[PDB]
């Protein structure tokens, strides 16, 4: 019943679904629409049920995974990643005006929990395969996400998001 | 009036095919390329004129009355794709070969018959006349020097055409030994009374010069408005306002009927939701919502709250030019010229004001109201002296620059910044870079890429051809040549300025 399967190691395989049904982690492959303030085109994050985001790819591969950049929300990832200027938080704040989350929509976020972080080479291979698969599907299947900056008039950032939900073994 | 007519008369004698220098364009090719450029400009500007190209001095003929050595390649019609394609077919070395093959060069002609054929072409048009103009593209200064009978008839016919209303113009090209207008012409070409007696264009040797001369002398100047400049309530003179610069926009699509492709001429109507009938202009009001309050005014009062002064220019004073800042630009400038048709004596006062303002280096601060019920803007009339280049082309018209001045509301605030200076060595290195990257700037050195691409696509579609070939943008910097010219100066500047860590 799994929508897709990715080989993790010799023993176990990881199931990838297009819907959030009893799933812990969500990988989002994001293409940012052209804005005069944004210097980065595409990114990729892993989000857990608490909203914690780990950055995976920045159109140069999965090499930025080793830096282990963890943010409390997707807005923080945007603040620290996609803007060339220094103090982005001093100019505006990013939020969704419908209280929607990039991965869980209008669900209840869980309390602060530790984010899954790759350790072994099997994890790195799995993320490489997942990023290639997400890039393959990005041209056909994706949805629209909107963030709003509290400027006068308000700034709108449009994202094209491809989402994949899955779980890691204990 | 409103539909100008222009006839391109191109000589086809042997001298129009000698090139002398092997790197210089043939005068015939110069003429063909100039005409094709004029066609492209007319289509791009969407200007509805009538153009015709006629050759004389050929063995074959196509004119209505079967005169000798006069081919009418194109009659008077709006510019289009196929005419430009044919002219392009005549272009170049192969174009010259095919031109000679299909219309041979070198024969005896008579200018009287050529002008008669051009007059008949002007007469054959049904959609009014307005301005009628003929341009000669020749490099022979004495065409009938051995036949005085032809020359006298040519002068008589030229005088008759000038009396009818047709304006004859010369585009003399480079000739070995120079071109002398006083030999044969000056008895045929049109001279505008005493204003255009002297100051005639020099002979053309390059394509850009000839194109500039052709475009300068066929475009009729249209005034945006004809305002009044008032020194006070009593002394008022008449001036014309012109837009020497204007942004070129991509034409929007037009609506056409499926049964027959033609304009629709859309109309707007006001309807009532309940009754379903028409609404009189006095049966509606204007509203504005502020918070939870509705403010209601009639249309007349909405117009009245914008009314300050009557239209025209009111003189406020005279201010030194050093007090005008280059970084206070607000909106594109206009041009102010005297108008003699409305108030008699305006030109003398205009000339005296221009002369004295140039002598004293002063600008006239005035208040500007373009039309009725418009709040005023402060403008500066900066005196502008006439300037001509080596070809005697007017690169700068005499008159006044109308420069718009910002209000306090149009000046925005800058954030606080700490001033960081640069050491003299870094400034010297950057000076070296600037010197290595020097060129000469001209106001007509760049073309709009979006417009060019749009019209190239439209031209390919109208000719029912395949996808066109994209052209390299001329506003995109040539990074490779810049890098080769700069060399290691960039590396040295980076070593002096950029810290190794960042």
């Amino acid at each position: 019943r799994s929508m897709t399967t990715i080989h993790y190691n010799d023993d176990v395989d990881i199931d990838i679904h297009t819907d959030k049904n009893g799933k812990e982690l969500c990988y989002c492959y994001i293409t940012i629409d052209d804005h005069y303030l944004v210097d980065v085109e595409t990114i990729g994050v892993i989000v857990n049920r608490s909203g914690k985001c780990l950055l995976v790819n920045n159109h140069l591969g999965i090499g930025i995974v080793k830096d282990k950049r963890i943010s409390d929300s997707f807005g923080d990832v945007c603040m620290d990643t996609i803007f060339d200027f220094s103090e982005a938080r001093e100019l505006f704040s990013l939020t969704n005006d419908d209280n929607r989350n990039i991965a869980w929509d209008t669900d209840k976020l869980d309390d602060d929990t530790d984010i899954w972080t790759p350790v072994t080479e099997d994890d790195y291979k799995f993320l490489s395969r997942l990023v290639l698969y997400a890039k393959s599907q990005s041209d056909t299947v994706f949805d629209y996400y909107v963030l709003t900056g509290d400027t006068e008039p308000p700034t709108v950032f449009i994202f094209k998001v491809t989402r994949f939900y899955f779980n890691m073994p204990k | 009036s409103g539909r100008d007519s222009l006839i391109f008369l191109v000589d086809a004698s042997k001298a129009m095919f000698e090139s002398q220098s092997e790197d210089e364009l043939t005068p015939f090719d110069m003429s063909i390329q100039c005409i094709q450029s004029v066609y492209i400009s007319k289509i791009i500007s969407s200007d509805r004129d009538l153009l015709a190209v006629v050759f004389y001095g050929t063995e074959k003929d196509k004119n209505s009355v079967n005169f000798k050595n006069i081919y009418v390649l194109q009659e008077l019609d709006n510019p289009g794709a196929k005419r430009i394609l044919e002219l392009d077919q005549f272009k170049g070395q192969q174009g010259q070969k095919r031109f000679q093959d299909m219309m041979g060069h070198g024969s005896d002609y008579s200018l009287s018959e050529v002008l008669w054929v051009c007059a008949n072409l002007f007469s054959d048009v049904q959609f009014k006349m307005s301005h009628k103009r003929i341009m000669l593209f020749t490099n022979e200064d004495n065409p009938h020097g051995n036949d005085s009978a032809k020359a006298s008839r040519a002068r008589t016919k030229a005088g008759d055409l000038r009396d009818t209303g047709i304006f004859l113009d010369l585009m003399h090209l480079k000739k070995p030994g120079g071109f002398d207008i006083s030999l044969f012409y000056r008895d045929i070409i049109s001279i505008a009374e005493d204003e255009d007696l002297r100051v005639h264009f020099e002979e053309s040797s390059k394509l850009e010069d000839l194109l500039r001369k052709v475009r300068a002398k066929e475009t009729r100047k249209r005034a945006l408005s004809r305002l009044k400049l008032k020194l006070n309530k009593d002394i008022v003179i008449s001036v014309g306002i012109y837009n020497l610069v204007q942004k070129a926009l991509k034409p929007p699509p037009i609506k056409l009927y499926r049964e027959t492709n033609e304009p629709v001429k859309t109309k707007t109507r006001t309807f009532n939701t309940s009754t379903g009938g028409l609404l009189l202009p006095s049966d509606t009001k204007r509203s504005q919502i502020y918070g939870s309050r509705q403010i209601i005014l009639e249309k007349e009062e909405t117009e009245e709250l914008k009314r300050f002064d009557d239209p025209g220019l009111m003189l406020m004073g005279f201010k030194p030019l050093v007090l005008l800042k280059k970084h206070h630009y607000l909106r594109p400038s206009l041009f102010v010229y005297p108008e003699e048709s409305l108030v008699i004596g305006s030109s003398t006062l205009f000339s005296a004001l221009l002369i004295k303002c140039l002598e004293k280096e002063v600008a006239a601060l005035c208040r500007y109201t373009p039309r009725r019920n418009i709040p005023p803007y402060f403008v500066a009339l900066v005196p502008q002296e006439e300037e001509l280049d080596d070809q005697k082309i007017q690169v700068t018209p005499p008159g006044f620059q109308l420069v718009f001045l910002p209000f306090a509301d149009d000046k925005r605030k800058m954030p606080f910044t700490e001033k960081i200076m640069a050491t003299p060595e870094q400034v010297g290195k950057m000076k070296a870079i600037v010197e290595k990257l020097r060129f000469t700037y001209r106001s007509d050195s760049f073309e709009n890429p979006v417009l060019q691409q749009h019209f190239r696509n439209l031209e390919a579609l109208a000719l029912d051809l395949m996808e066109p070939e994209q052209a390299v943008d001329l506003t995109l910097p040539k990074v490779e040549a810049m890098n080769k010219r700069l060399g290691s100066l960039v590396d040295e500047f980076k070593e002096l300025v950029y810290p190794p860590d960042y």
Binding site: E87 | L231, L244, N272, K356, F407, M430, A462
Partner: protein, 539 residues
């Protein structure tokens, strides 16, 4: 182009004197109470009709009552807080118009400043404010105590509260003093009393302590406040920066931020066409009917809107075009130097566009600042400008413009203005007037014009220090349309059954040159009228 700002608000306390002496009359000048009312009304109308988020409080001192939270008995008396920190509305405007009356008492303005400080300190706890401002409208004709002055200055510095002072008179030095008196125009040290001098000294010293030498620039008169934007100077916000990299070649890049320096201010709201009786938009149905170009009256469906383009004498339909066929693929946002050229080659008459940009180095970038300073100084020393390609984003049409250096004592930057393309130039020919025998002016006419130009000079070389002074700087004058519109809107909101009032006299005064130029013109103007005959055509 449009202005995009950060989204921060400000708290403004207007401290106004309503005491006895700020009501005196004189044959030719309005009382200081009325002029202060005009300035406050201007400020509040702009705030209300621009729908800003700034919060305004009003504190009157000199009143007959006492409504301040620091009264405590026999202390801070005759100080009323007429309006607490909230968004301005039409109730405040009505109060300023015809509900606040002159008092019959006197109050120390330092105590009023203390009360205003207390309002800011205690009414901003639960909210966020980027700037805290106090504007004081007084005449300095009351006794005051100097005891609390140091505490006042320390509190202002600690809490970061700015001050502006507005007085019936000016702060000019050696002005030289000078028909009917006009308010708000561009053109009295002996007319002030000793108490006014002492108050002025205290105000000047407080301003110097708060800011410095530039603090004296922030003491205005009621007359010049109506013809300036001074009341909005400390609550203005700059635009969000445009970040990019100035590239000279493919190996030299400088991180830059561009701000809008000049941008035309426009009315934010349009007029909604509504029904005469119901006063609602829903009763109006506006439709477009093209039908046919002939008198046939045949029903036309919207399915026939296919449209097409014109290439002269031919039509290319939309059935033969594609969305991806005709689209200039921009290389992206860029600020790239096409090259360098002499300053005299780029002229002002060819400037195009509707904005001017100021280009600084990126914030917190020492290397970028040094590199940009080197470029600016190299351009200034060699008298050169940069021709650059400018693209706002991947969708905006690319532009070609000029960047020229701008060096001042406190900052240095580049200035960008758009330049024309070939298609934007109209090559007309005009008859020469110098070489015209028909329109050649005589010597007497030239002398008369010279006299007129000499008599209508709007500049002066004062002090013989080779310094040229402007007697009519129009770039410091606000646009009269906004004030006229606000006045008419307020009159309609408060007096529904009355016609719109005429234009205020001070708007006319600020749109006209000083009266010293008029008669100096009138004599040579009369001379010129005789020498130049101007007869209107009688076609």
């Amino acid at each position: 182009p449009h202005m995009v700002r950060s989204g921060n608000k400000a708290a403004v306390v207007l401290c106004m004197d309503v005491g006895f002496t700020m009501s005196n009359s004189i044959p030719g000048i309005e009382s200081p109470f009325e002029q202060a009312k005009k300035v406050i009304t201007m400020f509040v109308q702009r705030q209300v009709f621009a729908e800003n988020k700034d919060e305004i409080a009003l504190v009157l001192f000199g009143t007959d009552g006492t409504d301040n939270p620091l009264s405590g008995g026999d202390q801070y008396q005759n100080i009323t807080v007429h309006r607490h920190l909230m968004l301005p509305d039409f109730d405040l405007l009505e109060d300023i118009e015809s509900k606040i009356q002159p008092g019959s008492q006197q109050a120390d303005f330092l105590d009023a400043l203390i009360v205003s400080m207390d309002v800011i300190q205690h009414e901003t706890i639960g909210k966020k404010f980027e700037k805290r401002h106090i504007e004081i409208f007084t005449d300095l004709s009351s006794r005051f105590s100097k005891s609390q002055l140091d505490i006042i200055i320390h509190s202002l510095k600690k809490c970061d509260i700015s001050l502006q002072f507005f007085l019936p008179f000016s702060l000019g030095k050696e002005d030289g003093s000078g028909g009917p008196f006009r308010l708000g125009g561009h053109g009295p040290l002996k007319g002030i009393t000793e108490q006014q001098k002492e108050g002025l000294e205290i105000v000047k010293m407080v301003m110097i302590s708060l800011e410095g030498e530039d603090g004296l620039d922030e003491i205005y008169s009621f007359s010049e406040s109506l013809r300036k934007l001074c009341v909005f100077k400390k609550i203005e916000r700059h635009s969000i920066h445009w970040p990019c990299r100035l590239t000279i070649g493919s190996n030299l890049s400088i991180r830059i931020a561009a701000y809008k320096s000049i941008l035309q201010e426009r009315v934010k709201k349009t007029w909604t066409v509504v029904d005469a009786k119901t006063l609602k938009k829903e009763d109006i149905q506006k439709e477009t009917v093209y039908c046919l170009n002939d008198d046939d009256e045949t029903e036309v469906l919207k399915e026939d809107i296919i449209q097409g383009f014109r290439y002269g004498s031919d039509i290319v339909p939309f059935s033969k075009v594609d969305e991806e066929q005709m689209k200039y693929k921009s290389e992206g946002k860029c600020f790239s130097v096409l090259g360098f050229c002499k300053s005299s080659q780029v002229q002002r008459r060819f400037f195009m566009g509707n904005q001017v940009l100021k280009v600084f180095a990126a914030r917190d970038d020492e290397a970028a600042a040094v590199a940009l300073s080197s470029l600016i100084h190299a351009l200034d020393d060699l008298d050169m400008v940069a021709i650059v390609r400018y693209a706002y984003d991947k969708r905006a049409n690319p532009q070609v413009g000029v960047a020229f250096p701008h060096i001042k004592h406190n900052y240095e930057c580049l200035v960008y203005v758009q330049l024309p393309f070939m298609e934007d130039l109209r090559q007309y020919m005009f008859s020469s007037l110098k070489n015209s025998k028909k329109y050649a002016p005589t010597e007497a006419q030239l002398n008369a014009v010279d006299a007129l130009i000499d008599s209508m000079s709007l500049a002066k070389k004062d002090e013989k220090t080779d310094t040229l002074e402007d007697l009519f700087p129009t770039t410091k004058i606000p646009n009269p349309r906004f004030q006229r519109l606000f006045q008419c809107l307020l009159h309609r909101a408060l007096h529904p059954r009355e016609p719109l009032p005429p234009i205020q006299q001070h708007i006319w005064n600020m749109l006209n040159p000083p009266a010293e130029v008029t008669t100096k013109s009138q004599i040579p103007l009369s001379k010129i009228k005789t020498l130049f005959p101007l007869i209107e055509a009688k076609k």
